[PDB]
Amino acid sequence: RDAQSVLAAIDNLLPEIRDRAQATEDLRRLPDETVKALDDVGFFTLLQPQQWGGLQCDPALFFEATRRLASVCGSTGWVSSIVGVHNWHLALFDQRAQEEVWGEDPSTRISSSYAPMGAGVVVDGGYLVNGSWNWSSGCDHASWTFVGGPVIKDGRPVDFGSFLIPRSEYEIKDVWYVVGLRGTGSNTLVVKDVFVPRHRFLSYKAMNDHTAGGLATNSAPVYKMPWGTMHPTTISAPIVGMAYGAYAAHVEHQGKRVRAADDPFAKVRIAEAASDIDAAWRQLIGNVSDEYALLAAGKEIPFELRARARRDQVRATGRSIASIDRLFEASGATALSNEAPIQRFWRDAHAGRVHAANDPERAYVIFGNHEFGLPPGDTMV
Amino acid sequence: RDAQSVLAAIDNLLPEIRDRAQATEDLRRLPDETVKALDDVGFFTLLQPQQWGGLQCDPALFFEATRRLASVCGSTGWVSSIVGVHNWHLALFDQRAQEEVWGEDPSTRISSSYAPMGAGVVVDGGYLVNGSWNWSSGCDHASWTFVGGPVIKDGRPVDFGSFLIPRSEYEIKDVWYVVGLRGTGSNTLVVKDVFVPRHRFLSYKAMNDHTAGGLATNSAPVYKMPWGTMHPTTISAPIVGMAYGAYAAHVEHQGKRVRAAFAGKDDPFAKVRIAEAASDIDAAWRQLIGNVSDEYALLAAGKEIPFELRARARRDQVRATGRSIASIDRLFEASGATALSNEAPIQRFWRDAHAGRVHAANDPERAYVIFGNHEFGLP
Amino acid sequence: RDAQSVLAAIDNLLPEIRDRAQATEDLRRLPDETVKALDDVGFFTLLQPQQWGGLQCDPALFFEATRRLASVCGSTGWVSSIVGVHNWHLALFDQRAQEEVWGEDPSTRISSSYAPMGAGVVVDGGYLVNGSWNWSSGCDHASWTFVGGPVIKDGRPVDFGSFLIPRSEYEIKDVWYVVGLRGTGSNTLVVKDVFVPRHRFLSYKAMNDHTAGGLATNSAPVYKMPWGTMHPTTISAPIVGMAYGAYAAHVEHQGKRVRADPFAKVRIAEAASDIDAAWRQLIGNVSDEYALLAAGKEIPFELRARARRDQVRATGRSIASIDRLFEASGATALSNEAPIQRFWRDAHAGRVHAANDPERAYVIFGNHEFGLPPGDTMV
Amino acid sequence: RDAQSVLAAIDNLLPEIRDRAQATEDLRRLPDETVKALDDVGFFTLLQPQQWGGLQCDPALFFEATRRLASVCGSTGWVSSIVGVHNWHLALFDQRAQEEVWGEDPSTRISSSYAPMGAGVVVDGGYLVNGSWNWSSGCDHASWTFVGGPVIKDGRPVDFGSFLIPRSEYEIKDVWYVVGLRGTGSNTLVVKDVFVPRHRFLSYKAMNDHTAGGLATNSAPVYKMPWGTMHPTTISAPIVGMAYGAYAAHVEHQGKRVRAAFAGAKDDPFAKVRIAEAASDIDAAWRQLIGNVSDEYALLAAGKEIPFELRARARRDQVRATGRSIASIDRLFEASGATALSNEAPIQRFWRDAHAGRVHAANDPERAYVIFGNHEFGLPPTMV
């Protein structure tokens, strides 16, 4: 297999994942049958290092995947994007950590919650961690998890990063009763007095520096993309896919409807939505590609580009959502029924919107600072 | 010289053209200086056929040029784009028409007014043209002009296209007293009982077919580019350049302010305003130029351009204009009181874009119906 | 007892009604206790003729009632407005029809489905009625219904209006499973080969004519108000009400987070102002109309046109402001129990009616502005 | 003569002022002819106290008049509202200051520049005032001016207000070369070492407290009206008026194209949607802009006090009115297409004029919106 054949296989899955969207929403977590299928065609290998049988691929092709997934099932696209990018994150961890996860089984999955909703206290050999983390999309389908939060040594915050912990050392509290992305199963992770070895903590600082241990062995270009582009993009890409899905739905339904042998108003709003969605994607995937092309040539990623990515990325979410709102309003009465696909895309996108990577202001201030000749702050870049 | 060095030389014209902006406006048409500088650097040869010394370039580079020009002077960018693209249109005329225009002096320029404000009636060996055509940008700097309209036979139209007429067979009436694009000198061409030979008419139909006569000797891929993308983009590219100009102006001004205030307010909204406009401007340009390059790449590979792509180009192009103007308005508002001065560039960029917006190729509805119809399955 | 006291009494039901919102949503119809309480304080009497113990009130006070209800429970306010204006409509039917509905018990309620999803075929003594009408909000709580349709006389439509049919002659099909307005129970009404007497049909023409049989016995100025304002307003008023509900909900929660960001202040202020604007216009137009009727004057067509352009605008404004507050609410708004997402979901469901369509209203108004003649019958 | 009389008379001034519109722009200040006619119909007496022969009128009628004037000539509506309102502001100064201004000639006019671009230093019996104040609309037509700034006692700001200064003690610098409101002649005021006595300064705080001197002789309810409503509304009213002007320019032009295609034959829903939305939005700018003023005045005329929440609501609605007017004008102007680019097209003038007006400090949206949000949230509070 290679990157392109995995994409082809994913195309083939779309119709079945689509028909399952209701059931997916019902389960409040991905159906085992779709996760298995994904796993079987190689989706999770996509951004996985080749030392573990993976494809350590071009990041643009991976998001292009998630966009397809989200274009038939919001929750499927959302979880896939997030779980997949974890196999990219784990590659920046040092060999020891990687070994524990994929040693006996390379198709092992990791979930996460990067918001600092807990902490790890220094002991001999690493960390003693406690906290309750929420929103771990797809945690129901993973054997390990990351959790974000500071390192506290003798009181006070020294580092901030992610801790890697096994399913057996955290409880999963089912509190996923929300208005959108219902089937993401983004439950809550309870960590009590769990020791985590020093080789299962990765610093963001380290990642920024290109001194993350795992890079020695995993030297493919893709493992040097900035977290600030890679992570928020994992959030925006599926949302963009949701707009594509909402668009196709509405077009189908509006097509039959306007074959009655004029209605300029209906045409305009479809042309505008189509163009805004296209602009979202071009920018999002475009900044991703500009950065990977640079790394591929051995060159370095200038701050200006990372800042442009952040502002375009929050913007992409904005215009995907605005388009979906206009396509929803236009679908009229028949979009109100609990089964109607367009209303699902609309609910899902709005749920996704609350994710922190989507806060427009945060991202615009970073880009605004850079244009105005100001020192960087916000590390989410 | 090639396309790339012409692009490079145009960068070095930018500062002087910038400084000339007010003079340009006050003239109510382009200054001889600037027209001569563009000619000398080879700008007008960009889309000109090879057999005449032209570079028959990648259409995307021509448009990058117009963008840069318009980012310092709205009127220059607007005129340059329009008169430049006419060297493209003429390539499609059959050789004889070309010979009359370039045969003695290959640097000869042509203007146009494409909206149907007259007509040609069939007679022995051509047509009898009558009409009054407005909005001929840079007409004072051309010695031929295109005029658009139907060919009428015995009462009903039997064709539609462009008539190529020399300086001496039409009158220029100065009517350019407007709120924006004042330097464009977009005056009115008056044509009375003028005979045009058939080899100086060109059907739009004949361009779509690829039956247009000039195509035989002018074989480069650029000349297979669709009229429906080339002409509207010629209008959009400069409007987007103006948005770039507006942006740079507002950032230079506002930047000196946020710095300095950085020593004992905090105006997060000044940065939101700036991040949003740069994003929307980038998007306009990516789509506008993106569509150009997709089409050209197809042609370069001896492939054909699918109808759906041509319809995306139209929806994107009118949208591009819209993104630009909307972004310029936000920037203009954000510049506050200083932007009102007659000598502040941002109010010129703003008036210019709004004046450019009234062009037919920018009507959004008309383009959106086209893309909608295609989406919906309709004709 | 009068409209102001009914109004003040409605204030008291608000806390109970707000707390019942979730139970109302789960029930998929209004809980019996809320219908009972509304009947107790006299809400259904508000637009009802005096001969039936009704208050035949100034309609601005009725709509102000629905707004208050919708600000604590979107479904309650929606159902109350619609069922409540039905007592206005019946007053226009001739005396005998009112007799049959209210003579025995004046507290009897009526539901509707006005869209023409069936028809009435002329027969001996009246009509034979057939169809399946959807979206009958509050039908579970009514013992009669209106269904909209044409009158068919020998295969050709000769009239259009409403037929009034008793519970025993139609079936209620439970099909109400929706993203919002869950508590409205807008189920479907199945009507098979049902005879309706001539006196239980009212033409819309006759309602515009002022020849509706009921005006002889019910001469209060409120019954002379135009259907084109009254009906669409019973849809818009509650929606505006929901915006008020969403606003209060968001200010309360966000207000504590703050006693712990100018951005939050801006969203809230634009939202507050756009909501206020929507209400002022919607209720202003209704009040101006009634004032003329009450003075003995006629309503000019231009006021009616304005009512309609403002009415669909009020909805747009309300829904945009809700959309902004709901976004601002962020993560908390996602829990299935969050009141703000209910308002958000209820508002967008109400938007599909059907009478919030802006184009139709705006065409009516544009035509009038352009001096074009009245064509469309509104609604 | 009363306030309704003056209004009626202003109506018959409209066509002339409309006709003058272009001449006005080119002058870069209002024509003596206009100013003279406004004076003669009694426009400037509207908010002037009765002791000076003024009408001390219902301020809603005042703002209505500026709307009307601004609906035919933006500059004229702009200058008129601003200079007219100064007769209101002067009413709050000490009786002595009113005497100096209107003692001989009750029709004398005042201009202003209210932003702190200078300062007054405490000296015996008054202040020593220095500064360069820009943007003084209509100054070429006034013989007095207000200039705003803090009072500096021993090098520290200890109060804030307006200083009243006669023409002989300041220079009018001509610098008005702008893209819009060309005819307002909003030039610069230079004041160098000018003594201003105690009684020709008015603290904003004192206006708020109701301790301003003028209240001793001017008891009419209009003078209890808040500065934070009167001053910003004077900026917004004319702008809404410009929006009314553009609306009618557009409607009469567009109507031909739409009626012509009404049978043969293109249908044009877009054009009517666009006109319905603007009309509704302009109507909404006016309802709340004038409603807040009416609600305020209705309280004062009945001896009641104005609650802070109305003043805060007034401010959110006033900057919001400006915004709505400008968004609507933008849409109408775009829609009017190529004939609207002409130097003689009124709409392009309304468009440039409204966008010039927008830069005024009283229109900044965030400041007003922060005031209103603070109040909704409990936060402690100015305005203008």
Short mmCIF file of N, CA, C and O in Angstrom, two decimals, chain C residues 180-243:
data_model
loop_
_atom_site.label_atom_id
_atom_site.label_comp_id
_atom_site.label_asym_id
_atom_site.label_seq_id
_atom_site.Cartn_x
_atom_site.Cartn_y
_atom_site.Cartn_z
N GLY C 180 -35.75 21.32 16.69
CA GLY C 180 -36.23 22.40 17.55
C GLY C 180 -37.74 22.56 17.59
O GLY C 180 -38.47 21.93 16.83
N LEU C 181 -38.22 23.43 18.48
CA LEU C 181 -39.66 23.56 18.70
C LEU C 181 -40.25 22.19 18.97
O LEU C 181 -41.28 21.82 18.41
N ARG C 182 -39.58 21.42 19.83
CA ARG C 182 -40.00 20.06 20.08
C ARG C 182 -41.32 20.03 20.85
O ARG C 182 -42.20 19.24 20.56
N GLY C 183 -41.45 20.93 21.81
CA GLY C 183 -42.67 21.00 22.60
C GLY C 183 -43.90 21.53 21.88
O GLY C 183 -44.96 21.59 22.49
N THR C 184 -43.80 21.92 20.61
CA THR C 184 -44.97 22.48 19.93
C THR C 184 -45.98 21.44 19.47
O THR C 184 -47.14 21.76 19.25
N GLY C 185 -45.52 20.20 19.32
CA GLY C 185 -46.37 19.11 18.85
C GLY C 185 -47.09 19.45 17.56
O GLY C 185 -48.29 19.23 17.43
N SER C 186 -46.35 20.00 16.59
CA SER C 186 -46.93 20.35 15.29
C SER C 186 -47.19 19.10 14.44
O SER C 186 -46.61 18.93 13.36
N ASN C 187 -48.08 18.25 14.93
CA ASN C 187 -48.40 17.01 14.25
C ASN C 187 -49.22 17.18 12.99
O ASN C 187 -49.53 18.30 12.58
N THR C 188 -49.56 16.06 12.37
CA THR C 188 -50.28 16.09 11.10
C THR C 188 -51.77 15.73 11.23
O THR C 188 -52.16 14.92 12.08
N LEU C 189 -52.59 16.36 10.39
CA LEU C 189 -54.04 16.22 10.45
C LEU C 189 -54.58 15.53 9.20
O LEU C 189 -54.45 16.04 8.09
N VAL C 190 -55.19 14.37 9.39
CA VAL C 190 -55.70 13.58 8.27
C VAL C 190 -57.21 13.68 8.16
O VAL C 190 -57.94 13.32 9.10
N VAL C 191 -57.67 14.16 7.01
CA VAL C 191 -59.09 14.44 6.81
C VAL C 191 -59.65 13.71 5.58
O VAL C 191 -59.22 13.96 4.44
N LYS C 192 -60.60 12.80 5.82
CA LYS C 192 -61.15 11.99 4.73
C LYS C 192 -62.66 12.18 4.50
O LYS C 192 -63.48 11.88 5.37
N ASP C 193 -62.99 12.67 3.31
CA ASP C 193 -64.37 12.77 2.86
C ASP C 193 -65.29 13.38 3.91
O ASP C 193 -66.33 12.81 4.25
N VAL C 194 -64.88 14.55 4.39
CA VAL C 194 -65.56 15.25 5.46
C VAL C 194 -66.40 16.39 4.89
O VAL C 194 -65.89 17.27 4.19
N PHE C 195 -67.69 16.37 5.19
CA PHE C 195 -68.60 17.44 4.81
C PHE C 195 -68.40 18.64 5.71
O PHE C 195 -68.42 18.52 6.94
N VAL C 196 -68.23 19.80 5.09
CA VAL C 196 -68.15 21.05 5.83
C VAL C 196 -69.23 21.99 5.31
O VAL C 196 -69.31 22.22 4.11
N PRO C 197 -70.08 22.51 6.21
CA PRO C 197 -71.18 23.39 5.78
C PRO C 197 -70.67 24.74 5.28
O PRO C 197 -69.59 25.17 5.68
N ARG C 198 -71.44 25.39 4.41
CA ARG C 198 -71.03 26.66 3.84
C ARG C 198 -70.59 27.67 4.90
O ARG C 198 -69.66 28.45 4.67
N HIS C 199 -71.22 27.64 6.07
CA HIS C 199 -70.89 28.62 7.11
C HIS C 199 -69.55 28.35 7.83
O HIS C 199 -69.05 29.22 8.56
N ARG C 200 -68.98 27.17 7.62
CA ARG C 200 -67.66 26.86 8.17
C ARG C 200 -66.57 26.92 7.11
O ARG C 200 -65.56 26.22 7.20
N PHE C 201 -66.80 27.75 6.10
CA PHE C 201 -65.72 28.18 5.22
C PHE C 201 -65.65 29.70 5.17
O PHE C 201 -66.67 30.39 5.04
N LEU C 202 -64.43 30.22 5.29
CA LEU C 202 -64.23 31.66 5.17
C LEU C 202 -63.17 31.94 4.11
O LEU C 202 -62.02 31.50 4.23
N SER C 203 -63.57 32.66 3.07
CA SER C 203 -62.65 33.08 2.04
C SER C 203 -61.68 34.11 2.60
O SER C 203 -62.02 34.88 3.50
N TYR C 204 -60.46 34.11 2.08
CA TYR C 204 -59.51 35.16 2.41
C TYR C 204 -59.96 36.45 1.73
O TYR C 204 -59.84 37.54 2.29
N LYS C 205 -60.48 36.30 0.52
CA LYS C 205 -61.00 37.42 -0.26
C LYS C 205 -61.99 38.21 0.59
O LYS C 205 -61.90 39.43 0.69
N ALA C 206 -62.91 37.48 1.21
CA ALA C 206 -63.90 38.06 2.10
C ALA C 206 -63.26 38.69 3.33
O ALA C 206 -63.80 39.64 3.89
N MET C 207 -62.11 38.17 3.75
CA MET C 207 -61.42 38.78 4.89
C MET C 207 -60.80 40.11 4.49
O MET C 207 -60.85 41.08 5.24
N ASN C 208 -60.23 40.17 3.29
CA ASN C 208 -59.77 41.44 2.76
C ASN C 208 -60.92 42.38 2.41
O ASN C 208 -60.84 43.59 2.65
N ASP C 209 -62.00 41.82 1.86
CA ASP C 209 -63.20 42.57 1.48
C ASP C 209 -63.83 43.29 2.65
O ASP C 209 -64.45 44.34 2.49
N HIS C 210 -63.71 42.69 3.83
CA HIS C 210 -64.47 43.09 5.00
C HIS C 210 -65.92 42.63 4.87
O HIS C 210 -66.83 43.23 5.43
N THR C 211 -66.11 41.53 4.15
CA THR C 211 -67.43 40.94 3.96
C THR C 211 -67.56 39.64 4.74
O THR C 211 -68.61 38.99 4.73
N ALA C 212 -66.47 39.25 5.39
CA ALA C 212 -66.48 38.10 6.29
C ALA C 212 -67.68 38.22 7.22
O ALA C 212 -67.86 39.24 7.88
N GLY C 213 -68.49 37.16 7.26
CA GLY C 213 -69.77 37.19 7.95
C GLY C 213 -69.71 37.61 9.40
O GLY C 213 -70.64 38.25 9.90
N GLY C 214 -68.61 37.28 10.06
CA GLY C 214 -68.42 37.60 11.46
C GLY C 214 -68.34 39.07 11.82
O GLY C 214 -68.61 39.44 12.96
N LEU C 215 -67.97 39.93 10.87
CA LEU C 215 -67.83 41.35 11.20
C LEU C 215 -69.16 42.02 11.57
O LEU C 215 -69.17 43.04 12.25
N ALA C 216 -70.27 41.43 11.15
CA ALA C 216 -71.57 42.00 11.51
C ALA C 216 -71.79 41.91 13.02
O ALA C 216 -72.18 42.88 13.66
N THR C 217 -71.52 40.74 13.59
CA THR C 217 -71.67 40.55 15.04
C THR C 217 -70.44 40.96 15.88
O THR C 217 -70.58 41.27 17.06
N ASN C 218 -69.26 40.98 15.28
CA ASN C 218 -68.04 41.36 16.01
C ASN C 218 -67.37 42.60 15.42
O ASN C 218 -66.47 42.52 14.59
N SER C 219 -67.82 43.75 15.89
CA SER C 219 -67.51 45.02 15.26
C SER C 219 -66.30 45.70 15.87
O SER C 219 -66.01 46.85 15.53
N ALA C 220 -65.61 45.02 16.78
CA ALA C 220 -64.43 45.62 17.42
C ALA C 220 -63.33 45.92 16.39
O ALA C 220 -63.14 45.17 15.43
N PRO C 221 -62.61 47.04 16.57
CA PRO C 221 -61.66 47.42 15.53
C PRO C 221 -60.55 46.38 15.31
O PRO C 221 -60.03 46.31 14.19
N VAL C 222 -60.21 45.57 16.32
CA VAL C 222 -59.15 44.57 16.12
C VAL C 222 -59.44 43.56 14.99
O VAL C 222 -58.52 43.04 14.37
N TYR C 223 -60.72 43.30 14.70
CA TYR C 223 -61.04 42.30 13.67
C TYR C 223 -60.95 42.83 12.24
O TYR C 223 -61.13 42.07 11.28
N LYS C 224 -60.64 44.12 12.13
CA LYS C 224 -60.49 44.80 10.86
C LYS C 224 -59.03 44.87 10.46
O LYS C 224 -58.69 45.38 9.38
N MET C 225 -58.15 44.37 11.33
CA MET C 225 -56.72 44.30 11.04
C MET C 225 -56.47 43.31 9.90
O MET C 225 -57.13 42.27 9.82
N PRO C 226 -55.51 43.63 9.01
CA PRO C 226 -55.19 42.79 7.84
C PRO C 226 -54.55 41.45 8.18
O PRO C 226 -53.65 41.39 9.02
N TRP C 227 -55.00 40.39 7.51
CA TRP C 227 -54.45 39.05 7.69
C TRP C 227 -52.97 39.03 7.36
O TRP C 227 -52.21 38.30 7.98
N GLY C 228 -52.56 39.83 6.39
CA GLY C 228 -51.17 39.89 5.97
C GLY C 228 -50.21 40.40 7.03
O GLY C 228 -49.01 40.14 6.98
N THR C 229 -50.74 41.14 8.00
CA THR C 229 -49.93 41.55 9.12
C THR C 229 -50.11 40.59 10.29
O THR C 229 -49.14 40.07 10.86
N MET C 230 -51.36 40.34 10.64
CA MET C 230 -51.64 39.53 11.82
C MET C 230 -51.00 38.15 11.81
O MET C 230 -50.32 37.77 12.76
N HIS C 231 -51.21 37.39 10.74
CA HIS C 231 -50.71 36.02 10.67
C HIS C 231 -49.19 35.92 10.70
O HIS C 231 -48.63 35.24 11.57
N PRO C 232 -48.49 36.58 9.76
CA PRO C 232 -47.03 36.51 9.80
C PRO C 232 -46.46 37.02 11.12
O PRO C 232 -45.44 36.52 11.60
N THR C 233 -47.13 37.99 11.72
CA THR C 233 -46.66 38.51 13.00
C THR C 233 -46.79 37.46 14.13
O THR C 233 -45.96 37.46 15.06
N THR C 234 -47.77 36.56 14.04
CA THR C 234 -47.92 35.53 15.09
C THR C 234 -46.76 34.56 15.00
O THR C 234 -46.49 33.83 15.94
N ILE C 235 -46.09 34.54 13.85
CA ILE C 235 -44.89 33.74 13.67
C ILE C 235 -43.63 34.51 14.14
O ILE C 235 -42.76 33.96 14.82
N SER C 236 -43.53 35.78 13.76
CA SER C 236 -42.33 36.55 14.09
C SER C 236 -42.25 36.92 15.58
O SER C 236 -41.18 36.80 16.18
N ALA C 237 -43.36 37.35 16.17
CA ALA C 237 -43.32 37.78 17.56
C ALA C 237 -42.60 36.79 18.50
O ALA C 237 -41.70 37.18 19.24
N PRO C 238 -42.98 35.49 18.45
CA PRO C 238 -42.36 34.50 19.34
C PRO C 238 -40.89 34.31 19.05
O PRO C 238 -40.10 34.13 19.98
N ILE C 239 -40.52 34.33 17.77
CA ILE C 239 -39.11 34.20 17.40
C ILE C 239 -38.29 35.32 18.03
O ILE C 239 -37.28 35.08 18.67
N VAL C 240 -38.76 36.56 17.88
CA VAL C 240 -38.16 37.68 18.57
C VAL C 240 -38.12 37.40 20.07
O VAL C 240 -37.15 37.74 20.75
N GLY C 241 -39.18 36.78 20.57
CA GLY C 241 -39.21 36.41 21.97
C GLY C 241 -38.05 35.51 22.34
O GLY C 241 -37.41 35.68 23.39
N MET C 242 -37.76 34.54 21.48
CA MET C 242 -36.68 33.61 21.74
C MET C 242 -35.33 34.32 21.78
O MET C 242 -34.48 33.98 22.60
N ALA C 243 -35.13 35.30 20.91
CA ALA C 243 -33.90 36.09 20.95
C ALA C 243 -33.73 36.71 22.33
O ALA C 243 -32.64 36.69 22.90
#
